[PDB]
From Swiss-Prot, chain A:
Parent sequence residues shown: 16 to 582 of 937
Subunit composition and interactions: Adaptor protein complex 2 (AP-2) is a heterotetramer composed of two large adaptins (alpha-type subunit AP2A1 or AP2A2 and beta-type subunit AP2B1), a medium adaptin (mu-type subunit AP2M1) and a small adaptin (sigma-type subunit AP2S1). Interacts with EPN1. Interacts with EPS15; clathrin competes with EPS15. Interacts with SNAP91; clathrin competes with SNAP91. Interacts with CLTC; clathrin competes with EPS15, SNAP91 and PIP5K1C. Interacts with LDLRAP1. Interacts with AMPH and BIN1. Interacts with ARF6 (GDP-bound).
Protein name: AP-2 complex subunit beta
Tissue expression remark: Expressed in the brain (at protein level).
Residues recorded as bearing N6-acetyllysine in the entry: K250
Membrane topology note: Peripheral membrane protein
Localization per record: Cell membrane; Membrane, Coated pit
Organism: Mus musculus
Lineage: Eukaryota, Metazoa, Chordata, Craniata, Vertebrata
Sorted UniProt keywords: Acetylation, Cell membrane, Coated pit, Endocytosis, Membrane, Phosphoprotein, Protein transport, Transport
Domain of life: Eukaryota
Primary localization: membrane
One GO location term (cellular component): synapse
UniProt GO molecular function: clathrin binding; protein-containing complex binding
Entry's family note: Belongs to the adaptor complexes large subunit family.
UniProtKB/Swiss-Prot annotation, chain B:
Residues holding a 1,2-diacyl-sn-glycero-3-phospho-(1D-myo-inositol-3,4,5-trisphosphate): R3, G4, K35, Y45, K49, Y50, V51, C52, K53
Residues of the full protein shown: 9 to 620 of 938
Function field: Component of the adaptor protein complex 2 (AP-2). Adaptor protein complexes function in protein transport via transport vesicles in different membrane traffic pathways. Adaptor protein complexes are vesicle coat components and appear to be involved in cargo selection and vesicle formation. AP-2 is involved in clathrin-dependent endocytosis in which cargo proteins are incorporated into vesicles surrounded by clathrin (clathrin-coated vesicles, CCVs) which are destined for fusion with the early endosome.
Annotated compartments: Cell membrane; Membrane, Coated pit
Gene: Ap2a2
Tissue specificity: Expressed in the brain (at protein level).
The organism of origin for this protein: Mus musculus (Mouse)
GO biological process: clathrin-dependent endocytosis; intracellular protein transport; postsynaptic neurotransmitter receptor internalization; regulation of hematopoietic stem cell differentiation; synaptic vesicle endocytosis; vesicle-mediated transport
Descriptive protein name: AP-2 complex subunit alpha-2
Result for mutant: K23Q: Reduces phosphatidylinositol binding
Curated annotation (Swiss-Prot), chain C:
Subcellular location(s) of the protein: Cell membrane; Membrane, Coated pit
Disulfide bonds: none
Database matches in InterPro entries: AP_complex_ssu, AP_mu_sigma_su, APS2, Clathrin_sm-chain_CS, Longin-like_dom_sf
A GO BP entry: synaptic vesicle endocytosis
Residue numbers bearing the Phosphoserine modification: S140
Record annotation: effect of changing V98S: Abolishes interaction with CD4 endocytosis signal motif
Keyword Protein transport: yes
Family (UniProt): Belongs to the adaptor complexes small subunit family.
This protein's GO CC annotations: AP-2 adaptor complex; cytoplasmic side of plasma membrane; postsynapse; presynapse; synapse
Gene Ontology MF: a single term: clathrin adaptor activity
Name of the molecule in the record: AP-2 complex subunit sigma
Organism: Mus musculus
UniProt topology in membrane: Peripheral membrane protein
CDD domains the UniProt entry points to: AP2_sigma (cd14833)
Swiss-Prot record, chain D:
Superkingdom classification of source: Eukaryota
Tissue spec. comment: Expressed in the brain (at protein level). Detected in spleen.
Localization of this protein: Cell membrane; Membrane, Coated pit
Annotated keywords: Cell membrane, Coated pit, Endocytosis, Lipid-binding, Membrane, Phosphoprotein, Protein transport, Transport
Entry GO CC: AP-2 adaptor complex; cytoplasmic side of plasma membrane; extrinsic component of presynaptic endocytic zone membrane; glutamatergic synapse; mitochondrion; postsynapse; secretory granule; synapse
Name this polypeptide is given: AP-2 complex subunit mu
Modified residues (Phosphoserine): S45
Source species: Mus musculus (Mouse)
Keyword Phosphoprotein included in the entry's annotation: yes
Quaternary context: Adaptor protein complex 2 (AP-2) is a heterotetramer composed of two large adaptins (alpha-type subunit AP2A1 or AP2A2 and beta-type subunit AP2B1), a medium adaptin (mu-type subunit AP2M1) and a small adaptin (sigma-type subunit AP2S1). Interacts with ATP6V1H and MEGF10. Interacts with EGFR and TTGN1. Interacts with F2R. Interacts with PIP5K1C isoform 1; tyrosine phosphorylation of PIP5K1C weakens the interaction. Does not interact with PIP5K1C isoform 3. Interacts with KIAA0319; required for clathrin-mediated endocytosis of KIAA0319. Interacts with DVL2 (via DEP domain).
Annotated family: Belongs to the adaptor complexes medium subunit family.
């Protein structure tokens, strides 16, 4: 109760002190909701600092209640006419900050006068307030007039106001009634580029964000935009550079073999992009993700820059992992020795998933080329002999992949793999080992016992392992018909009688209706030779990658997921 | 006071990072090497100081694996502080040894044969605090004669009763049931009400494990309860907690009475009814004190009485009064009271005599769900809503759970979706509503739904036949919407591939359009979804000769044939070779009507049962 | 029954621990950390009966200490809530002033009080008067 | 772009919390306090997704400085903005500590109301802040 007593003061200075005490009490968690009318009464003053403090209080509290805050419209209208522009902008911003259904009717008329005046800061604040309005309860019919006012408000000589107006338009353009933004014709594009030249870093970023939605009619416009965007290599590190890289990569629709500007453009992309690996660790991580996507899209850019992506000892774990795959992306015939030496060096570290991904990278380098395949198979044998469990599982998955890549070349290792089978727990390793056993069942006379051992618990297990086991058993039967009736009958009965998955039941039936129809067709279909796989190494599906090229800057690239997968 | 411990705390508590305290522990190790390893150690003060210092070091968060044999040497002492330090140190740290443990047993055996309450109390506290194999084998049948065959102080009696509780809990095998139960159940009416508390706890545990052994306690228990509930407002002021007469004692007596069936003697149950109406009437009056603790104690004893009434399930008037009290409590200002009332009504909802009375509070339950905006309270509300679910409400109750799913943070989403799935499956008469509800669940939550719910939905759609046409339709008009979650893709692929012949009649849903929509969904999905869509593609090849060429053109590209995953490659090769042969006989023979699923397990119920606890 | 009794501070340090059945070395630390995470997030306008996995704890807020009592599902919440209130009160008129520094200084007194009112997982004595009289009786010697 | 903004303590306390969006509520505070600071899995990434909501965080001295958004903003946007905000705080009051944050609540609130509106970082050079910001 003493809060009210100490707040109800007649001196203006002690009223200000009570105001900051109330702000501090709200910050620490105290509740002064019963003192709101007193603060409203004390609002009627002319002190700037008290004006800001009371406006902060008004936002923080009246955001929860519109009822008694309705009467504040008259005070806001009185405030938005005070000659000085600073408090005008503050008042209009705090007035727009209340998101209620009864404020739009009272703000539709007074807000019009704010968008048309001779002041850059006030115009910027008004544009931001219009963007604030359009978020909620602003579709109307006159709101089209407001958006037209914002749109032709682009015709300003101040970079800040035009930059924020363009950002607001880009954000509000999410609505798509088949009518896309109505604007950014070539003259507006030229004006936007001139502003980009004359803007600040933040509006530069906003303009580069918005500009990535135009479709050039001809190459000359694309050429002009390309040489008008290139000088964008600033001290803003990741933001401006990545936005320029995004817009350039989108504007590579001209023919690859044209006059020698395509090659020079590709040459331009390398220095500033590799420069990004010298900033803060988080922007380094973002740049590494973006470079991974770019290399996966266009691999003839970072061709001879492998040396920089060498993993350092002081780097954090996520940076280490992303530098590792970039390294594997850029490994080729010329850099085999040093890459494999580095991979062997990382293989002895203590961090778990880093060592897993390092041995996977060793195997993937093996997948890429043949001499690396032989040497990396030797290193995989050594790592298997090291007996470490997770390394063994990763090596088994890699060995399955290599067997798929190279047919009938590394048969001598299957006995060693079958020797250590009890150390498998993860579903991927079990599936890989089961497929290896099933495919090379002619060489192994002990495959029956292994598959029967995996057949003990058919339930309480991942569906992928069940499918792999079932297809391996069917393959083994079709290769050893004379003594494998019990296994196939049991596995088919388990699939089609107790499995809850309609996927597994479907596979059980699709094989059951084949093994009893025609053995010639069973041999021809199931055991049909499978073509080579031709450098499948950790690629993203091309449609997803192409859709992700349009979103280089955003979190879509960082998360490696489409924007529709998370709102 | 002791200066050493105070200096220790004041100095080492306010120091720098871990290296400083590590170096100070090293210095302490040097000091103990200097002194304990050899020399001549004093008896009382030095040993007390270093033992308490090492105990404090252990409590700080460090580990000590030595220095207790000379500490257990301290057990045989005359002064109380030394003995307490020794017992506390041997209780806090437990070691695996044979000679030292036997020395501990000899010392405690010598100590137990004392003639003062304090030493026996400390010995019993040490026995009950830890418990061990040697203590169990040596202190099994000799504690009862301290309890039964002895007129000693009350403190040692309570300690011995709780020691019997602990030993029976940890080693029931070697505790006999001999001729000692006569007085232990008889002392339930003893004075000082503390021996009463200990005996009530012990007998309650024993009856919870061995009910028929102590059936005679009912009469004394009900007599004590009747005396306690209404004797006087100023009687035994020592055991009155804020004007409430013995809350904990009454709670424990009510718990003891709950483990037994209603008494055969009509007089005993008559007294029970009398004291129950007495408790309810006493709770009816406005509080005698404005303090919240008085209300908390009164509501505690009232809730225990209500739980006993629910367990008995024999008095209709008592049940009606309890339900009225719960309905009054549903709008109580205190949050704890509302939460406890919700839990108690969820427990009570299983009673058939008050099922309609529980159902009459559905509007208040819905308002509480929509108003308080808590997490535990709203989980209790949805549990009670599930509890009161006879058919009678199915549409409204399912809609309310759907809304609460629409506003549900992280994991209550999963619990709600499982509960809604099982409830809709169990209480649906027109299964078209069930399919619509399932699609609503998939659309609303999507990311956090299940892995078994869509299994069950596919099983229902396949099994029930007649509803398959509407299911296939609604799925088709739901697929082409801009909002299409991943699980919806799988369910739609399976159902539509299986039953496209029912929808092929409409020109708006030509098979070419269905295949194009499925392929448009194909390029952005995980591996299992792509496998399901490939199976649907081959089923279309069986069912739709018109689109045979286009499909065969689809799964022949190098993206879907040279893929990086084993399963997709195998499925593509198999289906492509089946379509290439196309004998028109084998392919039609293979993919048959696929008879409906049998009622195997109803895995949703098992999953939700396992999720509990 | 009463599973464990804790007095956590704002940071997470355990000024009083008491476990009524066997727990491992890492298990105690994991339990303390998860109890702290559960307790510190809730605010004043929340229930005092929060449950995790197979348990439910009864927590109160006194000065800068979080008195946490873990009990079984079937035990009465309000009785144990008033029990922890009574325990805090007995510490109040015992030391005449409750503070974390005093608890650290006289941890053996805290253990003897807890053993006086709690043993084998149940409630031993409920009255303040007899506990105070007995505890001050042994203070002279 | 940016939605809410949060600055946390070493022990898990909340120092300031300013929200620009109706999307961000106390759920964001609970999620970041439980699943980031109190998460036992040290190996993480600077961007974390919790129920379709990204949680960015940068650690300086001993504070968790987190920016929360519910839309696919530019990641470099928020990261560079957080770096520049930390630089501005260091310029105004040197070392960043719990006490330094506590004793300048009004200044921090005024700055964050002025340096950022609704999620559009406006200008943080030095030429605008010095003219019309009180001490």
């Amino acid at each position: 109760f003493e809060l009210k007593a100490e707040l109800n003061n007649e001196k203006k200075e002690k009223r200000k002190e009570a105001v900051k005490k109330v702000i501090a009490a709200m910050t620490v968690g105290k509740d002064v909701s019963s003192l709101f009318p007193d603060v409203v009464n004390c609002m009627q003053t002319d002190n700037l600092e008290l004006k800001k403090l009371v406006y902060l209080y008004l936002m923080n509290y009246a955001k929860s209640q519109p009822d008694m805050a309705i009467m504040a419209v008259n005070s806001f209208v009185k405030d938005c006419e005070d000659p000085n522009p600073l408090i005008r902008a503050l008042a209009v911003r705090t007035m727009g900050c209340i998101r209620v259904d009864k404020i739009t009717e009272y703000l539709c008329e007074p807000l019009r006068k704010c968008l048309k005046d001779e002041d850059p800061y006030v115009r910027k604040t008004a544009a931001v307030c219009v963007a604030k309005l359009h978020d909620i309860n602003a579709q109307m019919v006159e709101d089209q007039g407001f958006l037209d006012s914002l749109r032709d408000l682009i015709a300003d000589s101040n970079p800040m106001v035009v930059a924020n107006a363009v950002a607001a338009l880009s954000e509000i353009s999410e609505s798509h009634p088949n009518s896309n933004l109505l604007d950014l014709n070539p003259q507006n594009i030229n004006k936007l580029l001139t502003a980009l030249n004359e803007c600040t870093e933040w509006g530069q970023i906003f303009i580069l964000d918005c500009l990535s939605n135009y479709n050039p009619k001809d190459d000359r416009e694309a050429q002009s935009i390309c040489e008008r965007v290139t000088p964008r290599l600033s001290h803003a590190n990741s933001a401006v550079v990545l936005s320029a890289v995004k817009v350039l990569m989108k504007f590579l629709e001209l023919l690859p073999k044209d006059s020698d500007y395509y090659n020079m453009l590709l040459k331009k992309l390398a220095p500033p992009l590799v420069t990004l690996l010298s900033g803060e660790p988080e922007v380094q991580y973002v740049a590494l993700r973006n470079i991974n996507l770019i290399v996966q899209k266009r691999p003839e850019i970072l061709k001879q820059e492998i040396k920089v992506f060498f993993v350092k000892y002081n780097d954090p774990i996520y940076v280490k992992l992303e530098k590792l795959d970039i390294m594997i992306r850029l490994a080729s015939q010329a850099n085999i020795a040093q890459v494999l030496a580095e991979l062997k060096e990382y293989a002895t570290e203590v961090d778990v998933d880093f060592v897993r991904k390092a041995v996977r990278a060793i195997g993937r380098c093996a997948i890429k080329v043949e001499q690396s395949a032989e040497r990396c198979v030797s290193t995989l044998l050594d790592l298997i002999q090291t007996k470490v469990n997770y390394v063994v599982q990763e090596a088994i998955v890699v060995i399955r992949d290599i067997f798929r890549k190279y047919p009938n070349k590394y048969e001598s290792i299957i006995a060693t793999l079958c020797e250590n089978l009890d150390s498998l727990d993860e579903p991927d390793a079990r599936a890989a080992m089961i497929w290896i056993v099933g495919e090379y069942a002619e060489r192994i006379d002990n495959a029956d016992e292994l598959l029967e051992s995996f057949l003990e618990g058919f339930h309480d297990e991942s569906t992928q392992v069940q499918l792999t086991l079932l297809t391996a058993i069917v393959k083994l039967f079709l290769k050893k018909p004379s003594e494998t009736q019990e296994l196939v009958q049991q596995v088919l009965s388990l699939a089609t009688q107790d499995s809850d998955n309609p996927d597994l039941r479907d596979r059980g039936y699709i094989y059951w209706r084949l093994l009893s129809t025609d053995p010639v067709t069973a041999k021809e279909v199931v055991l049909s030779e499978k073509p080579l796989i031709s450098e499948e190494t950790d690629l993203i599906e091309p449609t997803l990658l192409d859709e992700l090229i349009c979103h280089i800057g955003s979190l879509a690239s960082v998360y490696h997921k489409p924007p529709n997968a998370f709102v | 006071g002791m200066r050493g411990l105070a200096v220790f705390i004041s100095d080492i508590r306010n120091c720098k990072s871990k290296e400083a305290e590590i170096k100070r522990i090293n210095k302490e190790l040097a000091n103990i090497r200097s002194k304990f390893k050899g020399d001549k150690a004093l008896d009382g003060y030095s040993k007390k100081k270093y033992v308490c210092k090492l105990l404090f070091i252990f409590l700080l968060g460090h580990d000590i694996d030595f220095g207790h044999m000379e500490a257990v040497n301290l057990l045989s002492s005359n002064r109380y502080t030394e003995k307490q330090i020794g017992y506390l140190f041997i209780s806090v740290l437990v070691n695996s040894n044979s000679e030292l443990i036997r020395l501990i047993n000899n010392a405690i055996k010598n100590d137990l044969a004392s003639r003062n309450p304090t030493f026996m109390g400390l010995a019993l506290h040490c026995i009950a605090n830890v418990g061990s194999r040697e203590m169990a084998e040596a202190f099994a049948g000799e504690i009862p004669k301290i309890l039964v065959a002895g007129d000693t102080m009350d403190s040692v009696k309570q300690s011995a009763a709780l020691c019997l509780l602990r030993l029976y809990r940890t080693s029931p095998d070697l505790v006999p049931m001999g001729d000692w139960t006569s007085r232990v159940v008889h002392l339930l009416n003893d004075q000082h009400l503390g021996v009463v508390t200990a005996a009530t706890s012990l007998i309650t545990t024993l009856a919870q494990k061995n009910p028929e052994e102590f059936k005679t306690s009912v009469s004394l228990a009900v007599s004590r309860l009747s005396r306690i509930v209404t004797s006087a407002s100023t009687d035994l002021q020592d055991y009155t907690y804020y004007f409430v007469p013995a809350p904990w004692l009454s709670v424990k007596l009510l718990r003891l009475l709950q483990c037994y069936p209603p008494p055969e003697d009509p007089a005993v149950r008559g007294r029970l009814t009398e004291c129950l109406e007495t408790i309810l009437n006493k709770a009816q009056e406005p509080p005698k004190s404005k303090k919240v603790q008085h209300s908390n104690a009164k509501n505690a004893v009232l809730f225990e009485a209500i739980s006993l009434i629910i367990h008995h399930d024999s008095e209709p008037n008592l049940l009606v009064r309890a339900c009225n009290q719960l309905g009054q409590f549903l709008q109580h200002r205190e949050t704890n009271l509302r939460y406890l009332a919700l839990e108690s009504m969820c427990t009570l909802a299983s009673s058939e005599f008050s099922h309609e009375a529980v159902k009459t509070h559905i509007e208040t339950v819905i308002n509480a769900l929509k108003t308080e905006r808590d997490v535990s309270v709203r989980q209790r509300a949805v549990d009670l809503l599930y509890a009161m679910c006879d058919r009678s409400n199915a549409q409204q109750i399912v809609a309310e759970m759907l809304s609460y799913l629409e506003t549900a943070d992280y994991s209550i989403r999963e619990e709600i979706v499982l509960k809604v799935a099982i409830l809709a499956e169990k209480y649906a008469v027109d299964y078209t509503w069930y399919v619509d509800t399932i699609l609503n669940l998939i659309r609303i939550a999507g990311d956090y739904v299940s892995e078994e719910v869509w299994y069950r939905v596919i099983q229902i759609v396949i099994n029930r036949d007649d509803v398959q046409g509407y299911a296939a339709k609604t799925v088709f008009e739901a697929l082409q919407a801009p909002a299409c979650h991943e699980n919806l893709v799988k369910v739609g692929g399976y159902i539509l591939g299986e039953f496209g012949n029912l929808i092929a009649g409409d020109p708006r849903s030509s098979p070419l359009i269905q295949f194009n929509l499925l392929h448009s969904k194909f390029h952005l999905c995980s591996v299992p979804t792509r496998a399901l869509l490939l199976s649907t593609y081959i089923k279309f090849v069986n069912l739709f000769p018109e689109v045979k060429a286009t499909i065969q053109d689809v799964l022949r590209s190098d993206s879907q044939l040279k893929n990086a995953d084993v399963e997709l490659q195998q499925r593509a090769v198999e289906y492509l070779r089946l379509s290439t042969v196309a004998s028109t006989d084998i392919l039609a023979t293979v993919l048959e009507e696929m008879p409906p699923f049998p009622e195997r397990e109803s895995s949703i119920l098992a999953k939700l049962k396992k999720k509990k606890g | 029954m009463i599973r464990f009794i804790l007095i956590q501070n704002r940071a997470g340090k355990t000024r009083l621990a008491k476990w009524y059945m066997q727990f491992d070395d890492d298990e105690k630390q994991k339990l303390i950390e998860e109890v702290h995470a559960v307790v510190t997030v809730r605010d004043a306008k929340h229930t005092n009966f929060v449950e995790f996995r197979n348990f439910k704890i009864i927590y109160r807020r006194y000065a800068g200490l979080y008195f946490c009592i873990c009990v079984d599902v079937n035990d009465n919440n309000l009785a144990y809530l008033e029990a922890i209130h009574n325990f805090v009160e007995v510490l109040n008129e015992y030391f005449h002033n409750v503070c974390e520094l005093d608890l650290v200084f006289n941890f053996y007194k805290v253990y003897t009080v807890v053993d006086e009112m709690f043993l084998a997982g149940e409630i031993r004595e409920t009255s303040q008067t007899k506990v105070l009289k007995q505890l001050l009786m042994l203070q002279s010697l | 772009m940016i939605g809410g903004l949060f600055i946390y303590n070493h022990k898990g306390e909340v120092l300031i919390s300013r929200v620009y969006r109706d999307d961000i509520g106390r759920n964001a505070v609970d999620a970041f306090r439980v699943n980031v600071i109190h998460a036992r899995q040290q190996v993480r990434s600077p961007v974390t997704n919790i129920a379709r909501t990204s949680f960015f965080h940068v650690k300086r001295s001993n504070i968790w400085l987190a920016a929360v958004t519910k839309q696919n903003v530019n990641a470099a946007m928020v990261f560079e903005f957080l770096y520049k905000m930390c630089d501005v705080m260091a310029a105004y009051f040197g070392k960043i500590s719990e006490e330094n944050i506590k004793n300048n609540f009004v200044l921090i609130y005024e700055l964050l109301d002025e340096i950022l509106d609704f999620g559009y970082p406006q200008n943080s050079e030095t030429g605008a802040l010095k003219t019309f910001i009180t001490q």
